[PDB]
Amino acid sequence: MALTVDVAGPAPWGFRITGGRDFHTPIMVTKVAERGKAKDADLRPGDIIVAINGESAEGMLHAEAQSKIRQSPSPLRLQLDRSTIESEV
Ligand code: NA
């Protein structure tokens, strides 16, 4: 599922990221702090960050994506890919 999340600021945003071009992996949210701005914003552990403030995250180094997020104006605009689930009942 593709989605666009706007996170109210300013930093600290209250989430964690993994990955980047130097690890040859995508930028992914791994944790959202229970008391924090990302919790309000509808951001979920496991969301892949496709774009940061309209700029593609594809070729960003870990530290590069980290820095762009921390330096970001409010709101932080993330383009996301989210893994949906289906349960049998
Ligand atoms: Na910021």
Numbering used by the authors: 1 to 89
What does the paper say about this structure?
a type I PDZ binding motif (PBM). proteins are widely considered to act as scaffold proteins. activation through intranuclear sequestration and subsequent degradation. assay confirms that HN12-NS1 and PDlim2 interact in vitro.
